């Protein structure tokens, strides 16, 4: 099971990847 | 990330970014509330008398323990328990090399062995000077805990009568070692100093020196 | 005549790591409430506060560099400062080099700011509400 930190890490990294595809457009 | 489960349309990507923002606010307040509680000041599941040591047994100097042991207990250990990471993993030899002859003068050993390294343990601890005695068998599927003894257990310290050697899983489909064995010891030595090598935070019981890279 | 409560502390001082026992010798339960390898030492909280003066609020990459030699979590910085500024969203404070003495004022002013509007939780003012 994840911790609160690990979840926030995935969420930020995810946010960066999507912001990258939103900017790629 | 993963790249193939992710959306590629604008409508799909904006929608996903909107839901992540909401979710970061959620796991933010859960992390502030977690840290504040821990901060002022929560209590862990660890008993107060436990004695954790995060170290690598290859790198660790056992003499530092030996000296600080004599300094405080006035004696070497009564019972030593192991769950070697057979081959995260340690070469079968490395563990073999460990100086466990230094660490205990008179008392018992408990080594956990899988069927593949069952024979190896016997001659591993006959090297350590221990005399093979008894086997505790755990039923979840089988795993065997091998017992040995060196020197003198004639002393009144130890209690010859044994809690039944057999033991069962506290839960169903469980992988951590069961707690009952820590009471088998407690019947065999009550309030005796005990060492655990390859320990884990859920192996932290009081009266126990626990050495593990994951503590 | 072997006292185990004293034998425990007396061992923990000489063998356990600095994070596991207080110099007191008692057990540091804060260490076991966080997974192994994600504990936040106090030498790390002072390292962060120091980084805010030299590199500002926004540059986590640069701070992780100097104070944590590239080993700390950018997002754990990003959050631990929210707790320093007692606010859930620190977009406003991006790029401001903030002195350690200005941080407590900014925290106290945001807690009290939070307390007044009943938009405060967990010593943190939530200026972003969902
Ligand atoms: C399989 S576990 C034993 C679990 C333990 N019996 C319990 O209470 O559940 C062995 C552990 O020893 C630790 N370990 C691995 N390599 C090590 C090394 N080289 N030195 C010391 N500890 C090690 C690891 O954390 C590994 O999980």
GROMACS .gro file of C-alpha atoms and ligand atoms in nm:
model
  397
    1UNK     CA    1   0.000   0.000   0.000
    2UNK     CA    2   0.121   0.350  -0.080
    3UNK     CA    3   0.195   0.630   0.164
    4UNK     CA    4   0.065   0.984   0.139
    5UNK     CA    5   0.401   1.103   0.012
    6UNK     CA    6   0.434   0.835  -0.257
    7UNK     CA    7   0.085   0.917  -0.383
    8UNK     CA    8   0.166   1.288  -0.408
    9UNK     CA    9   0.485   1.202  -0.596
   10UNK     CA   10   0.299   0.998  -0.857
   11UNK     CA   11   0.042   1.274  -0.878
   12UNK     CA   12   0.299   1.548  -0.937
   13UNK     CA   13   0.497   1.343  -1.191
   14UNK     CA   14   0.173   1.257  -1.367
   15UNK     CA   15   0.082   1.624  -1.360
   16UNK     CA   16   0.414   1.708  -1.526
   17UNK     CA   17   0.366   1.451  -1.804
   18UNK     CA   18   0.014   1.573  -1.886
   19UNK     CA   19   0.115   1.936  -1.869
   20UNK     CA   20   0.381   1.830  -2.117
   21UNK     CA   21   0.126   1.684  -2.358
   22UNK     CA   22  -0.107   1.979  -2.306
   23UNK     CA   23   0.182   2.207  -2.404
   24UNK     CA   24   0.285   1.980  -2.693
   25UNK     CA   25  -0.048   2.088  -2.846
   26UNK     CA   26   0.356   0.731  -1.736
   27UNK     CA   27   0.241   0.471  -1.825
   28UNK     CA   28   0.245   0.622  -2.181
   29UNK     CA   29  -0.018   0.384  -2.335
   30UNK     CA   30  -0.288   0.412  -2.066
   31UNK     CA   31  -0.262   0.790  -2.086
   32UNK     CA   32  -0.492   1.005  -2.301
   33UNK     CA   33  -0.371   1.186  -2.607
   34UNK     CA   34  -0.671   1.401  -2.697
   35UNK     CA   35  -0.690   1.753  -2.562
   36UNK     CA   36  -1.034   1.689  -2.413
   37UNK     CA   37  -0.895   1.378  -2.243
   38UNK     CA   38  -0.579   1.540  -2.114
   39UNK     CA   39  -0.743   1.853  -1.973
   40UNK     CA   40  -1.003   1.637  -1.803
   41UNK     CA   41  -0.728   1.433  -1.641
   42UNK     CA   42  -0.535   1.738  -1.525
   43UNK     CA   43  -0.849   1.878  -1.367
   44UNK     CA   44  -0.904   1.559  -1.163
   45UNK     CA   45  -0.537   1.539  -1.056
   46UNK     CA   46  -0.543   1.892  -0.915
   47UNK     CA   47  -0.848   1.799  -0.703
   48UNK     CA   48  -0.665   1.487  -0.591
   49UNK     CA   49  -0.343   1.667  -0.492
   50UNK     CA   50  -0.548   1.895  -0.266
   51UNK     CA   51  -0.689   1.575  -0.117
   52UNK     CA   52  -0.362   1.397  -0.047
   53UNK     CA   53  -0.212   1.729   0.063
   54UNK     CA   54  -0.447   1.769   0.358
   55UNK     CA   55  -0.402   1.399   0.441
   56UNK     CA   56  -0.026   1.456   0.449
   57UNK     CA   57  -0.044   1.773   0.661
   58UNK     CA   58  -0.277   1.598   0.905
   59UNK     CA   59  -0.046   1.293   0.905
   60UNK     CA   60   0.270   1.496   0.973
   61UNK     CA   61   0.104   1.713   1.238
   62UNK     CA   62  -0.022   1.406   1.427
   63UNK     CA   63   0.316   1.238   1.397
   64UNK     CA   64   0.465   1.569   1.484
   65UNK     CA   65   0.291   1.620   1.815
   66UNK     CA   66   0.349   1.334   1.884
   67UNK     CA   67   0.197   1.003   1.781
   68UNK     CA   68   0.309   0.666   1.911
   69UNK     CA   69   0.433   0.390   1.680
   70UNK     CA   70   0.346   0.019   1.712
   71UNK     CA   71   0.699  -0.048   1.844
   72UNK     CA   72   0.733  -0.157   2.207
   73UNK     CA   73   0.940   0.081   2.418
   74UNK     CA   74   1.215  -0.163   2.513
   75UNK     CA   75   1.295  -0.264   2.154
   76UNK     CA   76   1.644  -0.193   2.024
   77UNK     CA   77   1.660  -0.148   1.644
   78UNK     CA   78   1.987  -0.116   1.449
   79UNK     CA   79   1.981  -0.048   1.078
   80UNK     CA   80   2.302  -0.193   0.939
   81UNK     CA   81   2.444  -0.426   0.675
   82UNK     CA   82   2.581  -0.735   0.853
   83UNK     CA   83   2.868  -0.759   0.609
   84UNK     CA   84   2.970  -0.396   0.696
   85UNK     CA   85   2.866  -0.406   1.060
   86UNK     CA   86   3.136  -0.460   1.322
   87UNK     CA   87   3.004  -0.724   1.560
   88UNK     CA   88   3.265  -0.629   1.818
   89UNK     CA   89   3.094  -0.293   1.873
   90UNK     CA   90   2.789  -0.497   1.976
   91UNK     CA   91   2.995  -0.748   2.173
   92UNK     CA   92   3.159  -0.477   2.383
   93UNK     CA   93   2.840  -0.268   2.437
   94UNK     CA   94   2.669  -0.596   2.518
   95UNK     CA   95   2.909  -0.693   2.797
   96UNK     CA   96   2.910  -0.331   2.914
   97UNK     CA   97   2.532  -0.341   2.986
   98UNK     CA   98   2.392  -0.698   3.007
   99UNK     CA   99   2.706  -0.842   3.171
  100UNK     CA  100   2.657  -1.155   2.955
  101UNK     CA  101   2.632  -1.269   2.596
  102UNK     CA  102   2.299  -1.365   2.442
  103UNK     CA  103   2.062  -1.643   2.546
  104UNK     CA  104   1.871  -1.687   2.215
  105UNK     CA  105   1.957  -1.581   1.857
  106UNK     CA  106   1.708  -1.595   1.566
  107UNK     CA  107   1.772  -1.561   1.192
  108UNK     CA  108   1.587  -1.562   0.859
  109UNK     CA  109   1.873  -1.544   0.615
  110UNK     CA  110   1.793  -1.381   0.279
  111UNK     CA  111   1.892  -1.683   0.082
  112UNK     CA  112   1.999  -1.654  -0.277
  113UNK     CA  113   1.767  -0.806  -0.080
  114UNK     CA  114   1.971  -1.125  -0.095
  115UNK     CA  115   2.301  -1.233   0.056
  116UNK     CA  116   2.540  -1.481  -0.090
  117UNK     CA  117   2.494  -1.808   0.086
  118UNK     CA  118   2.856  -1.782   0.190
  119UNK     CA  119   2.837  -1.430   0.328
  120UNK     CA  120   2.589  -1.519   0.596
  121UNK     CA  121   2.790  -1.833   0.656
  122UNK     CA  122   3.090  -1.614   0.724
  123UNK     CA  123   2.910  -1.413   0.987
  124UNK     CA  124   3.077  -1.429   1.325
  125UNK     CA  125   2.803  -1.586   1.525
  126UNK     CA  126   3.047  -1.784   1.734
  127UNK     CA  127   3.157  -1.461   1.902
  128UNK     CA  128   2.807  -1.354   1.981
  129UNK     CA  129   2.679  -1.619   2.219
  130UNK     CA  130   2.854  -1.831   2.480
  131UNK     CA  131   2.573  -2.047   2.618
  132UNK     CA  132   2.218  -2.063   2.482
  133UNK     CA  133   2.011  -2.146   2.168
  134UNK     CA  134   1.980  -2.051   1.795
  135UNK     CA  135   1.665  -2.030   1.570
  136UNK     CA  136   1.737  -2.027   1.198
  137UNK     CA  137   1.464  -2.021   0.939
  138UNK     CA  138   1.523  -2.244   0.643
  139UNK     CA  139   1.333  -2.301   0.321
  140UNK     CA  140   1.338  -2.655   0.178
  141UNK     CA  141   1.612  -2.551  -0.069
  142UNK     CA  142   1.856  -2.438   0.201
  143UNK     CA  143   1.744  -2.685   0.469
  144UNK     CA  144   2.057  -2.901   0.468
  145UNK     CA  145   2.274  -2.590   0.433
  146UNK     CA  146   2.156  -2.446   0.763
  147UNK     CA  147   2.247  -2.758   0.961
  148UNK     CA  148   2.610  -2.747   0.854
  149UNK     CA  149   2.608  -2.367   0.868
  150UNK     CA  150   2.531  -2.376   1.242
  151UNK     CA  151   2.732  -2.689   1.320
  152UNK     CA  152   3.009  -2.463   1.203
  153UNK     CA  153   2.887  -2.207   1.451
  154UNK     CA  154   2.953  -2.469   1.719
  155UNK     CA  155   2.581  -2.530   1.777
  156UNK     CA  156   2.452  -2.880   1.838
  157UNK     CA  157   2.139  -2.951   1.632
  158UNK     CA  158   1.850  -3.033   1.859
  159UNK     CA  159   1.498  -2.959   1.744
  160UNK     CA  160   1.282  -2.833   1.455
  161UNK     CA  161   0.983  -2.599   1.486
  162UNK     CA  162   0.749  -2.642   1.191
  163UNK     CA  163   0.521  -2.364   1.068
  164UNK     CA  164   0.205  -2.442   0.873
  165UNK     CA  165   0.052  -2.162   0.668
  166UNK     CA  166   0.271  -2.480   0.286
  167UNK     CA  167   0.563  -2.545   0.518
  168UNK     CA  168   0.858  -2.356   0.658
  169UNK     CA  169   1.098  -2.506   0.911
  170UNK     CA  170   1.276  -2.323   1.195
  171UNK     CA  171   1.592  -2.515   1.298
  172UNK     CA  172   1.714  -2.503   1.657
  173UNK     CA  173   2.061  -2.558   1.799
  174UNK     CA  174   2.245  -2.524   2.129
  175UNK     CA  175   2.601  -2.474   2.247
  176UNK     CA  176   2.764  -2.481   2.585
  177UNK     CA  177   2.547  -2.514   2.893
  178UNK     CA  178   2.170  -2.479   2.908
  179UNK     CA  179   2.176  -2.684   3.229
  180UNK     CA  180   2.137  -2.352   3.417
  181UNK     CA  181   1.797  -2.284   3.574
  182UNK     CA  182   1.760  -1.991   3.335
  183UNK     CA  183   1.627  -2.210   3.061
  184UNK     CA  184   1.309  -2.416   3.088
  185UNK     CA  185   1.335  -2.763   2.937
  186UNK     CA  186   0.966  -2.815   2.884
  187UNK     CA  187   0.871  -2.684   2.545
  188UNK     CA  188   0.560  -2.514   2.417
  189UNK     CA  189   0.443  -2.746   2.144
  190UNK     CA  190   0.695  -2.736   1.864
  191UNK     CA  191   0.423  -2.703   1.594
  192UNK     CA  192   0.298  -2.349   1.513
  193UNK     CA  193   0.033  -2.190   1.288
  194UNK     CA  194  -0.023  -1.875   1.085
  195UNK     CA  195  -0.191  -1.591   1.276
  196UNK     CA  196  -0.364  -1.493   0.948
  197UNK     CA  197  -0.452  -1.668   0.625
  198UNK     CA  198  -0.218  -1.637   0.330
  199UNK     CA  199   0.049  -1.469   0.549
  200UNK     CA  200   0.423  -1.420   0.468
  201UNK     CA  201   0.575  -1.258   0.777
  202UNK     CA  202   0.694  -1.494   1.046
  203UNK     CA  203   0.435  -1.565   1.322
  204UNK     CA  204   0.448  -1.401   1.664
  205UNK     CA  205   0.396  -1.719   1.867
  206UNK     CA  206   0.764  -1.807   1.829
  207UNK     CA  207   0.847  -1.500   2.037
  208UNK     CA  208   0.653  -1.661   2.321
  209UNK     CA  209   0.810  -2.001   2.269
  210UNK     CA  210   1.128  -1.808   2.347
  211UNK     CA  211   0.945  -1.635   2.634
  212UNK     CA  212   0.862  -1.972   2.786
  213UNK     CA  213   1.216  -2.090   2.715
  214UNK     CA  214   1.380  -1.768   2.847
  215UNK     CA  215   1.163  -1.511   3.022
  216UNK     CA  216   1.316  -1.163   3.018
  217UNK     CA  217   1.633  -1.299   2.860
  218UNK     CA  218   1.828  -1.080   2.622
  219UNK     CA  219   1.775  -1.193   2.263
  220UNK     CA  220   1.927  -1.106   1.924
  221UNK     CA  221   1.749  -1.108   1.591
  222UNK     CA  222   1.948  -1.086   1.272
  223UNK     CA  223   1.767  -1.002   0.945
  224UNK     CA  224   1.500  -0.836   1.151
  225UNK     CA  225   1.206  -0.638   1.031
  226UNK     CA  226   1.002  -0.365   1.187
  227UNK     CA  227   0.720  -0.616   1.253
  228UNK     CA  228   0.986  -0.834   1.421
  229UNK     CA  229   1.040  -0.556   1.672
  230UNK     CA  230   0.950  -0.694   2.011
  231UNK     CA  231   1.081  -0.561   2.340
  232UNK     CA  232   1.376  -0.730   2.518
  233UNK     CA  233   1.515  -0.792   2.167
  234UNK     CA  234   1.818  -0.652   1.994
  235UNK     CA  235   1.711  -0.649   1.627
  236UNK     CA  236   1.966  -0.594   1.345
  237UNK     CA  237   1.834  -0.546   0.992
  238UNK     CA  238   1.903  -0.338   0.685
  239UNK     CA  239   1.532  -0.251   0.675
  240UNK     CA  240   1.487  -0.131   1.033
  241UNK     CA  241   1.904  -0.801   3.874
  242UNK     CA  242   1.900  -0.683   3.509
  243UNK     CA  243   1.678  -0.378   3.445
  244UNK     CA  244   1.553  -0.405   3.088
  245UNK     CA  245   1.409  -0.057   3.057
  246UNK     CA  246   1.752   0.085   3.149
  247UNK     CA  247   1.935  -0.186   2.948
  248UNK     CA  248   1.730  -0.083   2.643
  249UNK     CA  249   1.816   0.290   2.651
  250UNK     CA  250   2.176   0.213   2.746
  251UNK     CA  251   2.207   0.001   2.429
  252UNK     CA  252   2.014   0.234   2.200
  253UNK     CA  253   2.258   0.515   2.281
  254UNK     CA  254   2.569   0.317   2.184
  255UNK     CA  255   2.442   0.111   1.883
  256UNK     CA  256   2.122   0.250   1.728
  257UNK     CA  257   2.137   0.524   1.466
  258UNK     CA  258   2.089   0.886   1.568
  259UNK     CA  259   1.742   0.880   1.410
  260UNK     CA  260   1.613   0.584   1.614
  261UNK     CA  261   1.681   0.709   1.968
  262UNK     CA  262   1.680   1.054   2.119
  263UNK     CA  263   2.010   1.149   2.289
  264UNK     CA  264   1.780   1.101   2.585
  265UNK     CA  265   1.813   0.735   2.499
  266UNK     CA  266   1.437   0.683   2.466
  267UNK     CA  267   1.278   0.560   2.143
  268UNK     CA  268   1.198   0.805   1.856
  269UNK     CA  269   0.855   0.687   1.747
  270UNK     CA  270   0.844   0.960   1.481
  271UNK     CA  271   1.098   0.746   1.295
  272UNK     CA  272   0.878   0.441   1.275
  273UNK     CA  273   0.567   0.634   1.173
  274UNK     CA  274   0.742   0.696   0.839
  275UNK     CA  275   0.853   0.418   0.599
  276UNK     CA  276   1.219   0.317   0.591
  277UNK     CA  277   1.416   0.570   0.384
  278UNK     CA  278   1.148   0.842   0.377
  279UNK     CA  279   1.205   0.975   0.730
  280UNK     CA  280   1.258   1.349   0.764
  281UNK     CA  281   1.540   1.417   1.009
  282UNK     CA  282   1.551   1.751   1.192
  283UNK     CA  283   1.887   1.809   1.026
  284UNK     CA  284   1.675   1.803   0.709
  285UNK     CA  285   1.420   2.061   0.823
  286UNK     CA  286   1.698   2.305   0.908
  287UNK     CA  287   1.860   2.221   0.574
  288UNK     CA  288   1.538   2.324   0.399
  289UNK     CA  289   1.477   2.649   0.588
  290UNK     CA  290   1.835   2.738   0.498
  291UNK     CA  291   1.765   2.664   0.132
  292UNK     CA  292   1.479   2.911   0.117
  293UNK     CA  293   1.713   3.203   0.198
  294UNK     CA  294   1.978   3.103  -0.059
  295UNK     CA  295   1.760   2.979  -0.347
  296UNK     CA  296   1.400   3.098  -0.277
  297UNK     CA  297   1.067   2.915  -0.262
  298UNK     CA  298   1.037   2.790  -0.621
  299UNK     CA  299   1.374   2.637  -0.705
  300UNK     CA  300   1.343   2.292  -0.551
  301UNK     CA  301   1.581   2.144  -0.809
  302UNK     CA  302   1.856   2.387  -0.706
  303UNK     CA  303   1.792   2.340  -0.332
  304UNK     CA  304   1.789   1.960  -0.338
  305UNK     CA  305   2.123   2.012  -0.506
  306UNK     CA  306   2.311   2.210  -0.239
  307UNK     CA  307   2.161   2.100   0.089
  308UNK     CA  308   2.059   1.741   0.014
  309UNK     CA  309   2.321   1.655  -0.248
  310UNK     CA  310   2.052   1.551  -0.497
  311UNK     CA  311   1.888   1.288  -0.280
  312UNK     CA  312   1.572   1.445  -0.141
  313UNK     CA  313   1.227   1.442  -0.297
  314UNK     CA  314   1.133   1.755  -0.492
  315UNK     CA  315   0.772   1.703  -0.395
  316UNK     CA  316   0.853   1.646  -0.026
  317UNK     CA  317   1.023   1.984  -0.026
  318UNK     CA  318   0.721   2.124  -0.216
  319UNK     CA  319   0.496   2.008   0.070
  320UNK     CA  320   0.715   2.059   0.375
  321UNK     CA  321   0.730   2.426   0.293
  322UNK     CA  322   0.350   2.449   0.291
  323UNK     CA  323   0.376   2.341   0.656
  324UNK     CA  324   0.636   2.612   0.708
  325UNK     CA  325   0.410   2.874   0.551
  326UNK     CA  326   0.093   2.725   0.710
  327UNK     CA  327  -0.084   2.749   0.374
  328UNK     CA  328  -0.199   2.474   0.139
  329UNK     CA  329  -0.117   2.666  -0.182
  330UNK     CA  330   0.215   2.846  -0.204
  331UNK     CA  331   0.187   2.964  -0.566
  332UNK     CA  332   0.186   3.320  -0.429
  333UNK     CA  333   0.526   3.281  -0.261
  334UNK     CA  334   0.697   3.133  -0.568
  335UNK     CA  335   1.050   3.264  -0.614
  336UNK     CA  336   1.067   3.471  -0.295
  337UNK     CA  337   1.388   3.421  -0.097
  338UNK     CA  338   1.248   3.417   0.258
  339UNK     CA  339   1.456   3.458   0.572
  340UNK     CA  340   1.409   3.201   0.848
  341UNK     CA  341   1.267   3.476   1.066
  342UNK     CA  342   1.026   3.589   0.797
  343UNK     CA  343   0.894   3.232   0.763
  344UNK     CA  344   0.753   3.217   1.117
  345UNK     CA  345   0.587   3.554   1.064
  346UNK     CA  346   0.445   3.425   0.734
  347UNK     CA  347   0.326   3.111   0.909
  348UNK     CA  348   0.178   3.293   1.207
  349UNK     CA  349   0.016   3.548   0.978
  350UNK     CA  350  -0.138   3.269   0.762
  351UNK     CA  351  -0.251   3.056   1.057
  352UNK     CA  352  -0.417   3.360   1.216
  353UNK     CA  353  -0.539   3.451   0.866
  354UNK     CA  354  -0.678   3.099   0.850
  355UNK     CA  355  -0.819   3.103   1.203
  356UNK     CA  356  -1.028   3.413   1.139
  357UNK     CA  357  -1.206   3.289   0.824
  358UNK     CA  358  -1.252   2.930   0.956
  359UNK     CA  359  -1.045   2.825   0.654
  360UNK     CA  360  -0.772   2.670   0.876
  361UNK     CA  361  -0.701   2.298   0.930
  362UNK     CA  362  -0.406   2.116   1.084
  363UNK     CA  363  -0.210   2.437   1.158
  364UNK     CA  364  -0.247   2.514   0.783
  365UNK     CA  365  -0.465   2.775   0.615
  366UNK     CA  366  -0.643   2.630   0.315
  367UNK     CA  367  -0.669   2.909   0.063
  368UNK     CA  368  -0.765   2.645  -0.195
  369UNK     CA  369  -1.089   2.463  -0.110
  370UNK     CA  370  -1.240   2.175  -0.312
  371LIG     C1  371   1.330  -1.219   0.455
  371LIG     S1  372   1.371  -1.113   0.576
  371LIG     C2  373   1.329  -1.179   0.723
  371LIG     C3  374   1.193  -1.129   0.772
  371LIG     C4  375   1.184  -1.142   0.924
  371LIG     N1  376   1.204  -1.281   0.961
  371LIG     C5  377   1.052  -1.098   0.977
  371LIG     O1  378   1.045  -1.061   1.096
  371LIG     O2  379   0.954  -1.099   0.901
  371LIG     C6  380   1.534  -1.084   0.568
  371LIG     C7  381   1.559  -0.934   0.572
  371LIG     O3  382   1.694  -0.902   0.606
  371LIG     C8  383   1.729  -0.776   0.548
  371LIG     N2  384   1.859  -0.786   0.478
  371LIG     C9  385   1.878  -0.815   0.348
  371LIG     N3  386   2.009  -0.816   0.316
  371LIG    C10  387   2.077  -0.787   0.427
  371LIG    C11  388   2.218  -0.772   0.462
  371LIG     N4  389   2.313  -0.789   0.368
  371LIG     N5  390   2.249  -0.741   0.589
  371LIG    C12  391   2.153  -0.724   0.682
  371LIG     N6  392   2.022  -0.736   0.657
  371LIG    C13  393   1.978  -0.767   0.534
  371LIG    C14  394   1.620  -0.744   0.448
  371LIG     O4  395   1.539  -0.641   0.503
  371LIG    C15  396   1.538  -0.869   0.438
  371LIG     O5  397   1.401  -0.833   0.424
   0.00000   0.00000   0.00000
